[PDB]
Amino acid sequence: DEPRILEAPAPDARRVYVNDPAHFAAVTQQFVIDGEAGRVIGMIDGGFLPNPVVADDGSFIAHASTVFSRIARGERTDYVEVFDPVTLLPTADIELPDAPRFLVGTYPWMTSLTPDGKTLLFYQFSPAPAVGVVDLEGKAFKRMLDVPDCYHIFPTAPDTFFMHCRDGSLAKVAFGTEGTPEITHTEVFHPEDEFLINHPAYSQKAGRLVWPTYTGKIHQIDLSSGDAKFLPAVEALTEAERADGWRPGGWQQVAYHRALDRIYLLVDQRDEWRHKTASRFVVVLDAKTGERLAKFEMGHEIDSINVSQDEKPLLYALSTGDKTLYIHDAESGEELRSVNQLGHGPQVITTADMG
């Protein structure tokens, strides 16, 4: 009987990552799960409010994280770590001097990868807004880019990203390895009375940004041309439904399946200011036409959803209160398996678009 250290199975379309911010604790965990078997295949430790990213091609996973010399006080160190996806060992540990990370409840698009997988960008909120550039290939922090009062980072190319500005426009940021970035704005695409959620879905391979409002109105922006093309807005809930109190609600409220061009949105009946509460239903709609394809009753209080990007996708439904990931068939909405004991307050689901 010969003990050894195992290696995880190769990354595939069914692998799913669940991050546990642990209700703001100083140390957190990430669970790597095989969605097919419904088994935990590995884990990764992280510091305070880390931002995870996963290469779409499955070549690596990484996170931007923060540790302190004395648990939660003392010297602060912000850093990025890159990990091999099969051995789970770190392959790089890159310090980010001068504590530049934005510490906030986890929003996936506050730290992002360029399409080539060579650069990691992250948002700084204070002393002033900026976006830090990390060269993963050279293993080094390059520099901070000064930007206007804008938020989130959606990379469209090795040297370009979009941000959403307070004024309602998108800012196109072209950086260009030395200098001062060229910053361009689109038209304002939403009024001041439409509130865009903190967790839009973005498919980098498709260049599609899906962004819902507190009411379920869905703005779609196509970035595939290197420029923003605004698509026709779509209402996820009908007028009668809204009159009946239906509203989206949750943490990762929306998911987007690229190959099927389909949108998944968490909804339920709730007061207007209860937007972060869990939801028990999921509506499915055709992204081209706004047509409703299904409404599933999830049967549990779900805070976040995401989907596998394969041909017959899985629908992941994470419950923060139950600390369990429920795996469903995305076509029928039927519950297939469940993985429990996921930490203290799991909230974020990440999957790769390997296709």
Binding site: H23, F24, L103
Partner: protein, 125 residues
Amino acid sequence: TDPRAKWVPQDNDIQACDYWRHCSIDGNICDCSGGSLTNCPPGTKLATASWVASCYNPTDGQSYLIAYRDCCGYNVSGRCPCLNTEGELPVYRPEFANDIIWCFGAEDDAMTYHCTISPIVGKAS
């Protein structure tokens, strides 16, 4: 109980999540870890920045401006957790956003989250 139902404030138990002043708190009530309704627990660092909200006081039927400041430099208390979002807006309207760790300005550059206080800063209407 029904988490999705409209929030209903009360003015009798400060440690409960439905206490009137906690209308847009995200975190843990400081009173539950050695602080008070408006002061930080010993050993923590008091932030200067905050997110605000206008919370209705059932007792007098008025609304007050609450400035949620965090007490920082300690790991999360884990006692009396609460998440309410009355009037809470997205991150791009930060002054009203509650996922942000409001620790800016704390001594020693403390930035870890321990708990949040609910001081009144003025009237609302």
